[PDB]
From a paper:
Focused classification of the local density around the P-stalk revealed that binding of ribosomal protein eL40 does not occur until state III, prior to the recruitment of uL16 in state IV. Thus, Yvh1 and eL40 do not appear to bind simultaneously to the same particle. However, following the departure of Yvh1, eL40 stabilises H89 in its near-mature conformation by forming two major contacts with the opposing H91, including a stacking interaction of A2847 (H89) with G2898 (H91) and base pairing between C2844 (H89) and G2898 (H91). An observed contact between Yvh1 and the side chain of uL6 K141 overlaps with the binding site for the N-terminus of eL40 in state III, raising the possibility that the recruitment of eL40 may destabilise Yvh1 to promote its departure from the pre-60S particle. The incorporation of eL40 (state III) stabilises H89 to form one face of the uL16-binding platform and may also facilitate Yvh1 release by disrupting its interaction with uL6. In states I-III, the L1 stalk is displaced inwards with H38 in the ‘closed’ position. Although focused classification of state III identified a subset of particles in which the Nmd3 eL31-like domain is rotated towards H89, this class lacks [name] and Arx1, with Reh1 present in the PET. We suggest that the rotated conformation of the Nmd3 eL31-like domain in this subset of state III particles is a consequence of [name] dissociation during sample preparation rather than a physiologically relevant ‘pre-[name]’ state.
Residue numbers in the entry:
A (entry chain T): 2 to 160
B (entry chain a): 6 to 57
C (entry chain P): 8 to 276
D (entry chain E): 6 to 174
The structure:
Amino acid sequence: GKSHGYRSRTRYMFQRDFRKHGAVHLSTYLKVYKVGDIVDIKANGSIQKGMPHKFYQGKTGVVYNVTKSSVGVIINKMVGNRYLEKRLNLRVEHIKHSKCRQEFLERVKANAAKRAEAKAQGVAVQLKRQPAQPRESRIVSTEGNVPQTLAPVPYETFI
Amino acid sequence: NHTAHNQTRKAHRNGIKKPKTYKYPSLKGVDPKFRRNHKHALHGTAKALAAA
Amino acid sequence: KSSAYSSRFQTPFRRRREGKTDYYQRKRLVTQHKAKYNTPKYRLVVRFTNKDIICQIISSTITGDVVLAAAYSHELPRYGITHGLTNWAAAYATGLLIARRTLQKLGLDETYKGVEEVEGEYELTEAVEDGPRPFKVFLDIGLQRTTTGARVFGALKGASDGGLYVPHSENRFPGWDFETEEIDPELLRSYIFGGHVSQYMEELADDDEERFSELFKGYLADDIDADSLEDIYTSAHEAIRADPAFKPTEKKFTKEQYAAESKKYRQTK
Amino acid sequence: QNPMRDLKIEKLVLNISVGESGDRLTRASKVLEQLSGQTPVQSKARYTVRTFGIRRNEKIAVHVTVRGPKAEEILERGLKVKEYQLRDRNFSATGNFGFGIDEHIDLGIKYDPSIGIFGMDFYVVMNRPGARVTRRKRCKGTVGNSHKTTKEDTVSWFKQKYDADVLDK
RNA sequence: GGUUGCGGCCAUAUCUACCAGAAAGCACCGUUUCCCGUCCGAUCAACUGUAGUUAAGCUGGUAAGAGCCUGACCGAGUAGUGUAGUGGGUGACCAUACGCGAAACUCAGGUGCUGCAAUCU
RNA sequence: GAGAACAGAAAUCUCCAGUAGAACAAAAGGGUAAAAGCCCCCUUGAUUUUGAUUUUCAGUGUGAAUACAAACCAUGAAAGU
RNA sequence: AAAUAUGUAAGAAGUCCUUGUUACUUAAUUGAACGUGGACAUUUGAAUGAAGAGCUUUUAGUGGGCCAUUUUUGGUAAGC
């Protein structure tokens, strides 16, 4: 009958990209992982030790433990009507950091700086981001671009 | 037979709530070598902040 | 070949096309326990050209590897050795030199003297108590094939004698008996100095004298016999222990004229 | 012309396909430690065929690779069995060749009637100084096409040497 | 700028064909007594840089080249697609409204960048 | 592909090309080239104590796996596994 | 290589500085984790809304389902 294995329905998930086959490059064995760091899970089928399950591919989680050649991550899984903390240990080859938080961190490093600037400057500066507000007035010249009149084109002789 | 109709409406009546993260999580799943030393570190910090 | 072949062709890495680096080895030598977070892992690169030796102490980062110390064999004339530089004794001396240099760069040359009376045993740098532990480096012998008697372990022995901790075993030094698993320190001490060259010097001085004059030419030009090697190398060890520092070469030019001369030759676009 | 371009002999391999393992195979191997001087090396089989009557991992045949001056001497005394009359077909496009003799005793070796009568297969390979770069471990690399051996180089070398009188057919 | 050792990204770095390489370096090359491993000192091991060479490797150059990378008033606001309608159509299927929006292709340009240490007329 | 007596479309030997078109006990899929394949050397981590975790899932069992710890061992020059 | 759908983050349990603990870790007075003591504490660092947030016990009925749009699988096809 039907099968529900640990690696079922994984033909395309755990295969390597085009012309990225073979050994894992070294920059990932030299990256450093501390507790609290935020990591996105992407596995590779070159390394069957420490693999995650196909649910946790593409998810994002928080480190909670650091061991030789492997780190533990916490992930919130939906089952039924609640979320569950899933603690899973992975080798590093299936792990890359998350730049999502790093962008926020440098935004903080900037807002602190310009707050420090504006305080001594005696001015107030808005640090809350804003969406794409509507556009504003403007005046469009007609010097080199006269309005080029168009028309709907016909069908005959196009076919 | 294995019709998922109404199951998500059932899930979404009492919401789907997050697991209430706390400060100081549990130290059961961590490296015991780390844990053993953490105990001693904190005990010494206590015996130092008690003296000062 | 066709076009599909060239499209679907994945290249290997650059230092695998060039045939210079084993990544199956590098992955193991370099990667560290994640619990030792930024702790570097120092390798002792030993490489042998046809007429040089390169000893390097190397750590690793993402922006390429990083060097802590270096010791080439084309500087030993500072200490006395002039001939036989791609040699077992030369390797020993070079290892001792990188050792004694690194350890004074750190601060441990007075705490870990290593050995000074040399008789050729298997002896590891034992860590002093209530004090700093030895500097720990790991040997990475490139693509050099390991064989008992090889040069590359000369530097290993020299380093472990020079003061720093290279974990190793004695089953690849010369003078190791396969049948009984036993080492011959007399033979190893004979190899540390020029014993295996001196016996050939003496055996060709009664067997093939034209070939003696051909090979060992500089020795005779500098008035050297087969007995003075055991004096030269021992006089050089003490000198290395004395001044292992790197006084660089006085440059003729300043890296601008050196480029001005080459810029006219390289057939620029 | 230049040095480091001469088509020196790299090695000479002698092959003897005995076909079947036994005292015949040992007769075959016995000649080689007296001809070349080195012990031979027996060659296991690779597949299973009954037209010739063998199976896998049988030591059916033997060979030996000789280098150095002795190779050129053996070649000199083996060429006189062919009377120094080689074809151009035996020559290969890589710049090497060989020939198969029927009688082994025509080289200079002592005869016995019990050993048997079996032939031999000579094959030389000759390459300029600088082909270590295909064989070493560190920094392997291919030689340049201006440095490769060709049929037209080696037949010229062979016409020059030995007073060949090749049969360009 | 050149070269070597270790490297990072791993084809802009690969493949094919021709040319040049001053200095040093690397390399090729020379020798089997010892350690050592070979059917063979060919590879590996050891000794000498001594006898010779840049011929090759290596690097840099060139090409209607293949390949790879990059970007487009290119294809194309096309194909496909989410939402709506007591919209059309016998149906296949289609049109419209609010929105998202490709690709192969075509065109143009490019053909390794760089880190640590040492060293070079 | 080019070559070597018997030698043949096919016995053994040699050179060039060869991104894997081979092999990895067995289904298919994934993966793998100084290897995870082919040969050789040494061995028994196919061991002890008990726990945490992932998968099927009620977050129960069974089964199989993952990552550490405390011991003892192997292997290797060592890193390490 | 889309569209739709999907994971995470968008700060006080935060940012910076200083120096304390440890039997872990380091060549090490190196780091790891936890801290003390100071600085920012206004827009507490996107929008919209919040009709209160969190937690716990216990227990009923149910565990025969059907129709439609759209996608789709066997089936000639069905109110299959």
